[PDB]
Enzyme design. Structure first.
Site, PDB file in Angstrom:
ATOM      1  N   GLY A   1       0.838  -1.201   0.000  1.00 30.14           N
ATOM      2  CA  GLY A   1       0.000   0.000   0.000  1.00 30.14           C
ATOM      3  C   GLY A   1       0.889   1.274   0.000  1.00 30.14           C
ATOM      4  O   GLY A   1       2.109   1.183   0.067  1.00 30.14           O
ATOM      5  N   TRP A   2       0.260   2.435  -0.062  1.00 35.52           N
ATOM      6  CA  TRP A   2       0.930   3.712  -0.194  1.00 35.52           C
ATOM      7  C   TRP A   2       2.030   3.969   0.801  1.00 35.52           C
ATOM      8  O   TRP A   2       3.167   4.268   0.422  1.00 35.52           O
ATOM      9  CB  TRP A   2      -0.093   4.896  -0.217  1.00 35.52           C
ATOM     10  CG  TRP A   2       0.614   6.148  -0.466  1.00 35.52           C
ATOM     11  CD1 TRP A   2       1.133   7.016   0.480  1.00 35.52           C
ATOM     12  CD2 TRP A   2       1.063   6.621  -1.734  1.00 35.52           C
ATOM     13  NE1 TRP A   2       1.820   8.035  -0.139  1.00 35.52           N
ATOM     14  CE2 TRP A   2       1.805   7.813  -1.499  1.00 35.52           C
ATOM     15  CE3 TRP A   2       0.909   6.161  -3.052  1.00 35.52           C
ATOM     16  CZ2 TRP A   2       2.390   8.560  -2.559  1.00 35.52           C
ATOM     17  CZ3 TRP A   2       1.448   6.921  -4.093  1.00 35.52           C
ATOM     18  CH2 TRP A   2       2.178   8.100  -3.838  1.00 35.52           C
TER      19      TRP A   2
ATOM     20  N   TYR B   1      -9.073   5.520  -9.310  1.00 36.64           N
ATOM     21  CA  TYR B   1      -9.601   6.564  -8.465  1.00 36.64           C
ATOM     22  C   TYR B   1      -8.352   7.369  -7.962  1.00 36.64           C
ATOM     23  O   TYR B   1      -7.226   7.031  -8.341  1.00 36.64           O
ATOM     24  CB  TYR B   1     -10.493   5.957  -7.323  1.00 36.64           C
ATOM     25  CG  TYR B   1      -9.945   4.638  -6.708  1.00 36.64           C
ATOM     26  CD1 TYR B   1      -8.745   4.634  -6.021  1.00 36.64           C
ATOM     27  CD2 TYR B   1     -10.629   3.429  -6.829  1.00 36.64           C
ATOM     28  CE1 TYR B   1      -8.199   3.455  -5.472  1.00 36.64           C
ATOM     29  CE2 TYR B   1     -10.108   2.223  -6.221  1.00 36.64           C
ATOM     30  CZ  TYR B   1      -8.905   2.284  -5.557  1.00 36.64           C
ATOM     31  OH  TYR B   1      -8.332   1.198  -4.990  1.00 36.64           O
TER      32      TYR B   1
ATOM     33  N   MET C   1      -6.566   0.608  -9.867  1.00 37.09           N
ATOM     34  CA  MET C   1      -6.883   1.689  -8.914  1.00 37.09           C
ATOM     35  C   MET C   1      -7.431   2.936  -9.631  1.00 37.09           C
ATOM     36  O   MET C   1      -6.846   4.072  -9.580  1.00 37.09           O
ATOM     37  CB  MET C   1      -5.678   1.981  -8.011  1.00 37.09           C
ATOM     38  CG  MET C   1      -5.403   0.844  -7.001  1.00 37.09           C
ATOM     39  SD  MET C   1      -3.965   1.050  -5.966  1.00 37.09           S
ATOM     40  CE  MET C   1      -2.665   0.850  -7.182  1.00 37.09           C
TER      41      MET C   1
ATOM     42  N   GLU D   1       3.302  -0.024  -4.517  1.00 37.00           N
ATOM     43  CA  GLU D   1       3.040   1.299  -5.117  1.00 37.00           C
ATOM     44  C   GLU D   1       4.324   2.070  -5.233  1.00 37.00           C
ATOM     45  O   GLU D   1       4.699   2.764  -4.281  1.00 37.00           O
ATOM     46  CB  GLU D   1       2.034   2.056  -4.261  1.00 37.00           C
ATOM     47  CG  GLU D   1       0.623   1.431  -4.448  1.00 37.00           C
ATOM     48  CD  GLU D   1      -0.509   2.131  -3.708  1.00 37.00           C
ATOM     49  OE1 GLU D   1      -0.340   3.241  -3.216  1.00 37.00           O
ATOM     50  OE2 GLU D   1      -1.599   1.565  -3.651  1.00 37.00           O
TER      51      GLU D   1
HETATM   52  C1  LIG Z   1      -3.352  -0.408  -2.267  1.00 35.57           C
HETATM   53  N1  LIG Z   1      -4.469   0.654  -2.329  1.00 35.57           N
HETATM   54  C2  LIG Z   1      -5.507   0.513  -3.169  1.00 35.57           C
HETATM   55  N2  LIG Z   1      -6.322   1.583  -3.063  1.00 35.57           N
HETATM   56  C3  LIG Z   1      -5.830   2.423  -2.116  1.00 35.57           C
HETATM   57  C4  LIG Z   1      -4.624   1.833  -1.650  1.00 35.57           C
HETATM   58  C5  LIG Z   1      -3.922   2.542  -0.670  1.00 35.57           C
HETATM   59  O1  LIG Z   1      -2.832   2.139  -0.210  1.00 35.57           O
HETATM   60  N3  LIG Z   1      -4.442   3.772  -0.169  1.00 35.57           N
HETATM   61  C6  LIG Z   1      -3.678   4.512   0.852  1.00 35.57           C
HETATM   62  C7  LIG Z   1      -3.793   3.888   2.233  1.00 35.57           C
HETATM   63  C8  LIG Z   1      -2.939   4.832   3.093  1.00 35.57           C
HETATM   64  N4  LIG Z   1      -2.906   4.463   4.527  1.00 35.57           N
HETATM   65  C9  LIG Z   1      -2.118   3.330   4.915  1.00 35.57           C
HETATM   66  O2  LIG Z   1      -1.497   2.713   4.011  1.00 35.57           O
HETATM   67  C10 LIG Z   1      -2.109   3.004   6.284  1.00 35.57           C
HETATM   68  C11 LIG Z   1      -2.838   3.796   7.201  1.00 35.57           C
HETATM   69  N5  LIG Z   1      -2.671   3.314   8.412  1.00 35.57           N
HETATM   70  C12 LIG Z   1      -1.853   2.225   8.339  1.00 35.57           C
HETATM   71  N6  LIG Z   1      -1.532   2.049   7.040  1.00 35.57           N
HETATM   72  C13 LIG Z   1      -0.628   0.961   6.589  1.00 35.57           C
HETATM   73  N7  LIG Z   1      -3.570   4.906   6.820  1.00 35.57           N
HETATM   74  C14 LIG Z   1      -4.346   5.752   7.806  1.00 35.57           C
HETATM   75  C15 LIG Z   1      -3.596   5.234   5.504  1.00 35.57           C
HETATM   76  O3  LIG Z   1      -4.292   6.202   5.220  1.00 35.57           O
HETATM   77  C16 LIG Z   1      -5.602   4.367  -0.608  1.00 35.57           C
HETATM   78  O4  LIG Z   1      -5.991   5.471  -0.110  1.00 35.57           O
HETATM   79  N8  LIG Z   1      -6.305   3.703  -1.612  1.00 35.57           N
HETATM   80  C17 LIG Z   1      -7.580   4.353  -2.078  1.00 35.57           C
HETATM   81  C1  LIG Z   2       1.122  14.569  -6.503  1.00 34.77           C
HETATM   82  N1  LIG Z   2       0.321  14.394  -5.232  1.00 34.77           N
HETATM   83  C2  LIG Z   2       0.441  15.112  -4.101  1.00 34.77           C
HETATM   84  N2  LIG Z   2      -0.440  14.647  -3.194  1.00 34.77           N
HETATM   85  C3  LIG Z   2      -1.107  13.639  -3.763  1.00 34.77           C
HETATM   86  C4  LIG Z   2      -0.630  13.480  -5.064  1.00 34.77           C
HETATM   87  C5  LIG Z   2      -1.139  12.511  -5.913  1.00 34.77           C
HETATM   88  O1  LIG Z   2      -0.668  12.419  -7.043  1.00 34.77           O
HETATM   89  N3  LIG Z   2      -2.181  11.673  -5.465  1.00 34.77           N
HETATM   90  C6  LIG Z   2      -2.738  10.592  -6.367  1.00 34.77           C
HETATM   91  C7  LIG Z   2      -2.378   9.201  -5.801  1.00 34.77           C
HETATM   92  C8  LIG Z   2      -0.912   9.141  -5.285  1.00 34.77           C
HETATM   93  N4  LIG Z   2      -0.716   9.570  -3.847  1.00 34.77           N
HETATM   94  C9  LIG Z   2       0.244  10.602  -3.547  1.00 34.77           C
HETATM   95  O2  LIG Z   2       0.898  11.151  -4.447  1.00 34.77           O
HETATM   96  C10 LIG Z   2       0.443  11.002  -2.212  1.00 34.77           C
HETATM   97  C11 LIG Z   2      -0.274  10.417  -1.141  1.00 34.77           C
HETATM   98  N5  LIG Z   2       0.137  11.011   0.016  1.00 34.77           N
HETATM   99  C12 LIG Z   2       1.081  11.928  -0.303  1.00 34.77           C
HETATM  100  N6  LIG Z   2       1.253  11.910  -1.646  1.00 34.77           N
HETATM  101  C13 LIG Z   2       2.211  12.786  -2.415  1.00 34.77           C
HETATM  102  N7  LIG Z   2      -1.221   9.392  -1.417  1.00 34.77           N
HETATM  103  C14 LIG Z   2      -1.983   8.761  -0.296  1.00 34.77           C
HETATM  104  C15 LIG Z   2      -1.426   8.969  -2.761  1.00 34.77           C
HETATM  105  O3  LIG Z   2      -2.239   8.076  -2.969  1.00 34.77           O
HETATM  106  C16 LIG Z   2      -2.665  11.828  -4.160  1.00 34.77           C
HETATM  107  O4  LIG Z   2      -3.546  11.056  -3.780  1.00 34.77           O
HETATM  108  N8  LIG Z   2      -2.129  12.825  -3.299  1.00 34.77           N
HETATM  109  C17 LIG Z   2      -2.609  13.043  -1.903  1.00 34.77           C
END
Ligand SMILES: Cn1cnc2c1c(=O)n(CCCn1c(=O)c3c(ncn3C)n(C)c1=O)c(=O)n2C
Ligand SMILES: Cn1cnc2c1c(=O)n(CCCn1c(=O)c3c(ncn3C)n(C)c1=O)c(=O)n2C
Length: 377
Positions: free
Chosen positions: A78-79, A192, A190, A120
């Site tokens: 995940g992220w 969205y 993904m 990711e």
């Molecule tokens: C694989 N994937 C598919 N769709 C996703 C993701 C994903 O990783 N995340 C981002 C998820 C960020 N995150 C975490 O990873 C996370 C967490 N707390 C513990 N972990 C470990 N939180 C509060 C959090 O916000 C998303 O927001 N979306 C829509």
């Molecule tokens: C350019 N950027 C800056 N903020 C971002 C992004 C972005 O591209 N995206 C589209 C999806 C990839 N992504 C990010 O890049 C990202 C993030 N948290 C910090 N960043 C930087 N997350 C949870 C995330 O999913 C985001 O969702 N966020 C909030």
């Protein structure tokens, strides 16, 4: 005929009051597959990340006692996890072997039907160019270790699936699409976070089609473009699962008079009182904003709603947009829908006055799974 795969997140248990969501809150008849987000990794071996994960695994996998057809997977990555442990783990055949052994053991021990890789992303966020092809090797070796484990214990094979990028640039530096498609059971795209406040203008989280004003690379940020890219670049329609978000992205408007698509914005909108996520509201949080007399909009070209009030604007998905995307996915012959996340839909039924799990229920009805058996062994 269609899958309906739902992600459960293990930090939703920490939300206050009505937002707290535990595996017991999952209706076992709702989804065909449930994915547990997330496991982690330590010295190249899969591992838990919350103190109570083993107790959650038990309750989550125990839903298979109420509906014998349900399958569950564990998601790794995940992220927040980023790329460094993946890069080191794939980098040698020994690290890969170590990991793959750890996974068959973990998955059988806690009763998962498979693993969902949520790296990711290979080739981005610090992962070097060799990871694109190393991700394929990993996946091939995993799929093969799964095949041989099913023959040497005589049960059906663990499944291997992957959640994958919607960004064209991330796709290009990340995936050998034809090859990955051979060995993955499913591909969860993904579709969205296609727009959000980081862009400096309002925009939809998950629009089905482009905006008539979208040109250049902005023309790629819609579900239609992204799913057609995956399909035209080698993934079989039937393995391709369209991502549906049960939340939306919010923004601060620079000028509360300009409230259309593409309006300038000055930053992320406020965290909701339940998910507490800056720039994001759960569908049930958005229902509160609507009760509050936010003005409702419909982005007709992209088929998704938006809403605004004062200087706060939000683009999101509702029953209407989920239905429309679900008809579209059926016409285009995709394998089904993946939902992030089950804990962000209106699961108690009490915020939206649309029944329990209104969003995800819409998909169950539209993908023709209303009649899916829900019976114990
Ligand atoms: C694989 N994937 C598919 N769709 C996703 C993701 C994903 O990783 N995340 C981002 C998820 C960020 N995150 C975490 O990873 C996370 C967490 N707390 C513990 N972990 C470990 N939180 C509060 C959090 O916000 C998303 O927001 N979306 C829509
Ligand atoms: C350019 N950027 C800056 N903020 C971002 C992004 C972005 O591209 N995206 C589209 C999806 C990839 N992504 C990010 O890049 C990202 C993030 N948290 C910090 N960043 C930087 N997350 C949870 C995330 O999913 C985001 O969702 N966020 C909030």
């Amino acid at each position: 005929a269609y899958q309906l795969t739902c992600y459960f997140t293990n930090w939703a248990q920490y939300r206050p009051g009505l937002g707290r969501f535990m595996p017991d809150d999952i209706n076992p008849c709702l989804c065909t597959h449930l994915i547990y987000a997330f496991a982690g990794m330590q010295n190249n071996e899969i591992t838990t990340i919350e103190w109570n994960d083993v107790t959650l695994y038990q309750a989550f996998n125990g839903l298979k006692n109420k509906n014998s057809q349900l399958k569950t997977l564990l998601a790794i990555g995940g992220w927040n996890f980023g790329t460094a442990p993946f890069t080191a783990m794939v980098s040698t055949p020994e690290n890969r072997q170590t990991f793959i052994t750890s996974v068959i053991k973990f998955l059988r021990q806690y009763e998962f039907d498979g693993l969902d890789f949520d790296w990711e992303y290979p080739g981005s966020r610090g992962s070097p160019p060799q990871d694109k092809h190393l991700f394929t090797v990993l996946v091939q070796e995993m799929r093969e270790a799964f095949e041989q484990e099913a023959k040497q214990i005589n049960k059906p094979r663990l499944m291997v699936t992957a959640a994958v990028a919607a960004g064209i640039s991330n796709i290009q530096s990340g995936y050998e699409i034809p090859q990955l498609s051979q060995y993955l059971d499913y591909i969860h795209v993904m579709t969205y976070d296609l727009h959000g406040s980081w862009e400096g203008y309002t925009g939809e989280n998950s629009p089905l089609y482009k905006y008539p004003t979208d040109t250049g690379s902005n023309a790629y940020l819609n579900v239609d473009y992204v799913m057609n890219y995956w399909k035209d670049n080698g993934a079989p329609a039937e393995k391709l699962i369209v991502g549906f978000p049960t939340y939306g992205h919010n923004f601060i408007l620079s000028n509360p008079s300009n409230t259309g698509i593409g309006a300038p914005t000055s930053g992320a909108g406020p965290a909701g009182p339940y998910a507490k996520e800056s720039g994001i509201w759960a569908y049930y949080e958005i229902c509160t904003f609507l009760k509050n007399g936010a003005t409702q909009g419909w982005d007709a070209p992209q088929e998704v709603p938006y809403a605004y009030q004062g200087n706060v604007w939000v683009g999101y998905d509702n029953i209407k947009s989920f239905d429309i995307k679900a008809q579209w996915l059926k016409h285009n012959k995709f394998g089904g829908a993946m939902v992030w996340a089950i804990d962000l839909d209106d699961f108690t039924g009490t915020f939206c006055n649309q029944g329990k799990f209104p969003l995800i229920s819409t998909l169950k009805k539209a993908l023709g799974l209303q009649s899916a058996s829900c019976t114990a062994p």
